[model samples]
Target: GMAKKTLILYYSWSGETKKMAEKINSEIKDSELKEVKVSEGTFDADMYKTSDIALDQIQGNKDFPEIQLDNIDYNNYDLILIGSPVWSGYPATPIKTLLDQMKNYRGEVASFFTSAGTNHKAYVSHFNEWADGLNVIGVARDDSEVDKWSK
Candidate 1:
């Protein structure tokens, strides 16, 4: 059998984003799900502090950390949907890392984010700036809203 036409890539720290990812996977008629995992120990506070320092040093520089995508074949999909929880007014660091490593993504790209409040423009803008040459479908806040894509 042929693989699905879409791929859902995501990173979820607090489970909310994961739930949304799963829901999208179930609803999308034929899409594969790919979870992005940061290397073990990368989530520790010490590492986070170090990452903060690196981030500060690279602020406004468009620098991104290296990411590993061991199992995914980007060519198999027609569309890529990226989901993540908002952190510090930005998309999760791991998603940025993955985007940094990806090249020649010749497909449509969409972004969905879970945040506790209403501030999301920064995250959307950052994602748009980083993912050049790809059409960025608008951002979605709630899980129910994702159903609209099916139509």
Candidate 2:
């Protein structure tokens, strides 16, 4: 009689995260998919450069580009899935920015990520801090792993 309430919110830089997001979407079947796009004026490679000075300015502080979730109705979803790429062994800065702005997300949540190297513990820890109540699904480094999650 009614559809399951779920949403997949994702941000991808190198396209790996997007592939995982699609796999999750195909598996879930009924959930809505929402892409987190950062505000144009604020998103620049210069701002995201991984230098000592840049890292110092944003580390442990939620400072980066702003995302406009203008079309999302948080009330309609029962589960929220966050997907991002691992940057410097952590969730990307844009993801942190978005998480800080989410207002009504204290509900069922999961996370997935992709990286060139291996180190999921940091991502899990960061997710724990940013979205404490989240269910914390495991990260996927490749399409094969993501496919397994689909099953």
Candidate 3:
């Protein structure tokens, strides 16, 4: 039997979400890890500043951030495990950009997140809206939760 092809895609400004992505990659044998990069010079290092801009983008006050993938044809995989950091009670804007590109994806899609606040439900909702029909396999505020979810 062939193993499922998995792509663990995520974006992390503060490194937390990347950690979760790495854990899932390790747990799911043969999975690949890909980072979603926000276009250079679009975001700053300050979390406080970025949060305001991200929220405005969520409300359509600004453009969603630009992103490019090494592999845009996500239908090549059997499963996609998307991850992102929660910002202003939603997944980061780059994740929004990523999902918008995935509207035609044929593989199963799932998500996980890392948040400082208990706002992952909002994150999941917004994700479902953006990508449509995503299966939210797990979320983690702690590493232990991610460890369990990756299984």
Candidate 4:
């Protein structure tokens, strides 16, 4: 009973963030890892870099697709962790949607980010504004990018 129950929910398009998430998953020692998804999704890492849709959605502050997440027992966990890639300096749309739904969980939360250039300040800033009413603990820039993403 000394250990805390934690949940790590993340969304990675290019697989880099997934690797990061997996790495975090293994390191958390006592936690569950669940990947977040969106309905009717067609975007990928390649599109994330070249397409304007991701950027537009970030700028417009609009929803991309409906979020579909495994039923999470928020009440069972002491902390909640969220991860996502930086898309046009914003947390990926799917991550935003997931955070929107997490309003139901009034617990301490943290965020981790994976990006190409390590300019992750925006992700933290966005979380500050986005995670209203939620207890945000810290923002981490994970070193998961140093190695490849594994299962």
Candidate 5:
């Protein structure tokens, strides 16, 4: 196989997902790492308030949160790894917005998450649903689980 170009884009609420993204980036050669930023809909110390907002966004009860990405050339990478904190059993709202931006990306896409402990399969399915035609490689829950995809 040829050397691959990888892109790691992450949205961290409490730095947990960011740490995982960094670890994956360090292990993958020729990978570019970037953070996703949002102008609204982020969790604060008031977990209940912000969490309910996250739920609303997920359920379509509210509008999707706006996000900013440094990279628009997603097709340039052979692999793209999305990192986010699980919110109400799904990827964070900012990551949702980020996925909406990935129109017609033609590479393998994988995801990593920071959660108390949830099924990665469900999250992987969600990625497939959101991104639709792109190949979903797999999901990594922790540093040990990362070995499956990290080269």
Candidate 6:
């Protein structure tokens, strides 16, 4: 039972992202699920407004929304499964904020994006910056990871 402690960190706005996170949590056997909520409460389901806000953050015109759990004990886990939906080809701002806080994590790190069709370029680039010497892998929407983790 020396397996690495695993945690599923996710920021879900429209629910599917959290559905994916919960699915991974249930299937992963020993992992824990932690929700990442922005200080702004919840995002509207109106695609137009949400996409605009997403673009604002993606374009760096707005600050990334803050979450409640910024001081998480990263030492409590050896593997972190970051999950979030893609917004204009990148994970949501809350996820970025969480990833940014993980600069000190040198453990195994993997990320999953529930995108309509965006490539993993953004996720790969962003995740690698934080991964550093950690074991890292990026999972795409179409990857078997979704299927495997969901069930």
Better of 2 and 6 by lDDT: 6
What is the C-alpha lDDT profile of model 2 across 6-36, one tens digit per residue?
A: 6777776557466667766676756666777
Name the runs in model 4 displaced over 4 angstroms.
1-3, 42-52, 116-118, 143-151
In model 1, which residue pairs have backbone atoms overlapping below 3 Å?
none
Task: Give lDDT tens digits, candidate 3, residues 47-100.
Answer: 225444546565665566477668556766667776666656763567766766
TM accuracy, model 3: 0.71
TM-score of each: 0.70, 0.66, 0.71, 0.73, 0.73, 0.69
Backbone clash pairs for candidate 4 read: none
Counting clashing residue pairs in each candidate, in order, gives 0, 0, 0, 0, 0, 0
Query: Residue 103, candidate 6: how far off, in angstroms?
Result: 3.2
| Candidate 6 accuracy as TM-score | 0.69
lDDT of 1 by residue, 1-151 (tens): 5543778887665565677777778777777677776554466765533244323324564544444456777777667788776655663466666665456666666777767464566766666776665566666665555554444
Off by over 4 Å in 5: 1-3, 41-54, 118-121, 144-151
What C-alpha lDDT, on a 0 to 100 scale, does residue 132 get in candidate 2? 58
Global local distance difference test of model 4:
0.64
By summed lDDT, which 10 consecutive residues of candidate 1 come out lowest? 48-57
Question: Per-residue CA lDDT of candidate 5, range 19-123, in tens?
Answer: 677777788778877877766434555432434444566665556657766636776667787777664566356666666666667667777666646545676
How many collisions between residues are there in candidate 4?
A: 0
Q: Residue 22 in candidate 3 has what lDDT?
A: 71
Candidate 4 per-residue C-alpha lDDT over 18-55 given as tens digits, one digit per residue, 9 for 90 to 100:
77667666665467788776665356644334234556
Error of 1 at 106 (Å): 2.7
So what's the TM-score on candidate 2?
0.66
